[PDB]
Design a protein around this ligand. Structure first.
Ligand SMILES: Nc1ncnc2c1ncn2[C@@H]1O[C@H](COP(=O)(O)OP(=O)(O)O)[C@@H](O)[C@H]1O
Ligand SMILES: Nc1ncnc2c1ncn2[C@@H]1O[C@H](COP(=O)(O)OP(=O)(O)O)[C@@H](O)[C@H]1O
Lengths: 234, 371, 371
């Protein structure tokens, strides 16, 4: 979306080109990306929806976009003599419009996506200069009946918040970092500290691939304690 | 990073940054050298001015355009021009800026080659490219079809383009342009008693031409009119007073473009070569070309040229074809504008000629599709 | 589910859905490719237009009919034609649609073989079938007996049918059709001074033929008349003005169909081949055939062709049989109409070639009575 020859760049090109049209934009997009990438892909005609034109995949699943109107919605050539008029007006409008050559575009090359990608990076840097924390206020139910919830709707809030992506990235590694406090007392039922952990692990039939006790806690994939859950009880 | 767009032409160098809206720096592409000896020691007179500085020092210099008809004849003065452009007009190290160069069609290949070579050796740019002035002029007009009639100061060419395809066999170059009109005006201004012979006062004559001249919708009627009345005379003050007056000349001079016989050339007039270039194209695309006569370059900036042009080419063409003439009000810079537009593209960022590539393949690379 | 009816033919692809009343999509079966180089970057010019797109871009392309005389010679362009038809003209996934294809009689066996193979591999249809254009054109006419004289753009054939039985030993195919008439008109238009040589302007000539030409009831009388008077001259405006006028040519051109010697062919005329095809059939069925001459194909759409045809074949036949000529006003689409009719049937829904069957028996299944 952001690199050169990306979607935004191509949209800018078509906002510059003499006689560009929505069909030319769609073509240029396809010929520049289709097949030559994986995220970008063709829309699927189904579901009675009017028109999709290209499908992207994000951390929150796939989504296909409609292209009609993107050209004349993005071009915004800011006039200059009228801005001078504003600067010289007698109201307080001039308070807004108060008055290098490299990387500055012309008053005829202006485009919305550019200002977006500019202030977006302004954020993504000044926010990158600050320690983060996160809160995800869900709405679990259509109406105001507390305690009761439906999954599909909170499933949507799951992806829009993408916390499932966090649990996935922490999910393909060692999610379970646990001490001996419960490990010894729950696993001594098969072979009735560190060397005691080695004894209690070699004896309950686990291979040395899907776990690791580094020096303080033992690290575990998720699906292995369930294997023990039913077996570490007898 | 930013790309540079230097449109040389004759008469006027115009440069700027890709993506801008107008060339930042514009100055006459001349090199002057003193022709007296100078007597004030400590004045530290330099040995060769250039650009507006020479244009101001005219009185004691001898000016020499290093581009004659689209082609470069004195390479050292051209290098001085480029160096002055980069280091004073734009004040930018050309080390990290792909530059876009322009040239007329049907030029000596050695011109373009030596241009590339100097660009890569002397100034050591990261990349470069040479484009055809007419294509850029079409870009600037937001078209994609239509013959374009560029007419700068040294050359005049028609390029018919359709759907972005150029028909090269129908390109018509003609070596009649602003410099020739200036000379013819210098000539016919004698018959009133005014004598301008110095390379300096050729500039005076050029100013007179840019201010007073204009194309006449009907040559014979205007001639008879200027004969009868005197409502056409206009005065003009020279750099030392002594106002002068020109009458018939005002439209005699630019009339040449339609009757080149005035200066002894045999080729056909502007309208005629335009119509011929049309007729050489395939029959299925002639209506659009009739409808989209773009016009650029400073010589197409005469009051009335578009109307006379339309009348003539209408007289030549059939009657059921619509004749239109796209003459924007800023057309003098259409080449540079289109150049900035093109250079600012991203689908263009893979057409440049990389320094490494040129080192690999030598200046013969230009003619290759690294065009 | 719905079935497709794609009548390829030369010159004109006409497709649509079974059961409809007229083909939805109709466009020239040509594939154009640019022949200049193109200079405006970012135009994203595709490399091969097709159909009406190419017919509009004619001025800068080189058009190639991929079907010479009923037979497919360039399979890649034919595949482009089919793909464009399905995915843009009808906008339908061919995955779930049995398609009906047509071809002339006495064609190369490999033609229909490779056709079936491509239809099953590339497009992966569920089923398909290949029918004889003349049988369909008879279906559309609501007949069950009568010689059908289909004369498309590439080929011309007679098929005598009686009670729904075909007499293959009397099928007479002749390789003179609209394309040859177009070429002959291009030739004889020179003798007036008009010169069309480009594949683009062959289309202009085709339009002239479709508009102005007509068949003369008596060739000699019309020749002498055009000599004497000028009441036959008609004008025509080319795509760039410069109106032209044609006289004698208007009926000189389509007269070829009755005197193939004009283009240096040795075979007999249309009327005579028809009469011969009649005479090759059994004597008991000749009267019905005399009464039921059917005409299809765009080439049989000349003003006056039915009257001249009747006169000639009456002169050849005895004076006690009755000669009639069934020339509907929409006969140009009779093949597609008959195809839709036949595909709509249910007694036909077991004649298709199921993809499973082809996978089981290979493309040789076509000639096999799974026809
Ligand atoms: N207003 C004007 N009227 C007539 N001629 C003009 C006018 N302005 C400029 N010119 C002529 O046009 C020339 C400049 O054209 P230009 O497009 O700069 O040429 P080039 O493309 O070779 O640089 C000047 O030499 C001048 O003689
Ligand atoms: N009105 C007309 N008058 C004369 N000829 C015509 C007319 N319309 C079409 N044709 C000719 O008939 C041809 C189209 O016939 P068609 O039945 O489409 O052939 P095919 O069956 O091979 O596609 C065109 O090539 C054209 O030259």
């Amino acid at each position: 979306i952001e690199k050169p020859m990306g979607i935004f760049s191509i949209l800018e090109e078509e906002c510059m080109f003499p006689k560009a049209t929505d069909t030319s934009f769609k073509n240029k997009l396809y010929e520049q990306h289709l097949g030559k990438s994986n995220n970008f892909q063709k829309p699927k005609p189904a579901k009675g929806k009017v028109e999709a034109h290209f499908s992207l995949v994000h951390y929150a699943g796939t989504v296909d976009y409609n292209i009609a109107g993107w050209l004349d919605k993005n071009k915004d050539p800011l006039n200059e003599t009228v801005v001078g008029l504003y600067q010289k007006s007698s109201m307080k409008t001039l308070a807004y419009l108060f008055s290098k050559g490299a990387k500055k575009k012309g008053s005829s090359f202006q485009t919305v996506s550019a200002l977006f990608r500019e202030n977006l990076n302004k954020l993504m840097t000044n926010l990158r200069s600050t320690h983060p924390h996160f809160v995800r206020c869900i709405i679990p139910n259509e109406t105001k009946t507390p305690g009761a919830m439906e999954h599909e709707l909170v499933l949507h809030q799951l992806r829009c918040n993408g916390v499932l992506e966090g649990i996935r990235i922490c999910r393909k590694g060692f999610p379970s970092r646990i001490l001996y406090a419960d490990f010894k007392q729950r696993y001594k039922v098969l072979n009735a500290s560190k060397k005691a952990s080695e004894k209690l692990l070699g004896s309950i039939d686990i291979d040395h691939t899907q776990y690791k006790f580094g020096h303080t806690k033992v690290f575990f994939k998720a699906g292995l304690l369930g294997l023990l859950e039913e077996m570490r009880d007898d | 990073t930013t790309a540079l767009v230097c449109d040389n032409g004759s008469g006027l160098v115009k440069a700027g940054f890709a993506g801008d809206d107008a060339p930042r720096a514009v100055f006459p592409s001349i090199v002057g050298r003193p022709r007296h000896q100078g007597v004030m020691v400590g004045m530290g007179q330099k040995d060769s001015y250039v650009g507006d500085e020479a244009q101001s020092k005219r009185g004691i210099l001898t000016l020499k355009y290093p581009i004659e008809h689209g082609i470069i004849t004195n390479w050292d003065d051209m290098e001085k021009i480029w160096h002055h452009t980069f280091y004073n007009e734009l004040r930018v190290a050309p080390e990290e800026h792909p530059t876009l160069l322009t040239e007329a069609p049907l030029n000596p290949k050695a011109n373009r080659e030596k241009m590339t070579q100097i660009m890569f050796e002397t100034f050591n740019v990261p990349a470069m490219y040479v484009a055809i002035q007419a294509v850029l002029s079409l870009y600037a007009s937001g078209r994609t079809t239509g013959i374009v009639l560029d007419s700068g100061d040294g050359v005049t060419h028609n390029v018919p383009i359709y759907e972005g395809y150029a028909l090269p066999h129908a390109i018509m170059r003609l070596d009649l342009a602003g410099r020739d009109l200036t000379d013819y005006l210098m000539k016919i201004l004698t018959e009133r008693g005014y004598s301008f012979v110095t390379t300096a006062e050729r500039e005076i004559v050029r100013d007179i031409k840019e201010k007073l001249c204009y194309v006449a919708l009907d040559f014979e009627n205007e001639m008879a009119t200027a004969a009868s009345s005197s409502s056409l005379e206009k005065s003009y003050e020279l750099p030392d007073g002594q106002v002068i007056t020109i009458g018939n000349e005002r439209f005699r001079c630019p009339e040449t473009l339609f009757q080149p016989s005035f200066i002894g050339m045999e080729s056909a007039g502007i309208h005629e070569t335009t119509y011929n270039s049309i007729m050489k194209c395939d029959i299925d695309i002639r209506k659009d070309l009739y409808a989209n006569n773009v016009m650029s370059g400073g010589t197409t900036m005469y009051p009335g040229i578009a109307d006379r042009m339309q009348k003539e080419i209408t007289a030549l063409a059939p009657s059921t074809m619509k004749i239109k003439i796209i003459a924007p009000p800023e057309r003098k810079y259409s080449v540079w504008i289109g150049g900035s537009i093109l250079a600012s593209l991203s689908t263009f960022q893979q057409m440049w000629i990389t320094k490494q590539e040129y080192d690999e393949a030598g200046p013969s690379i230009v003619h290759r599709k690294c065009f």
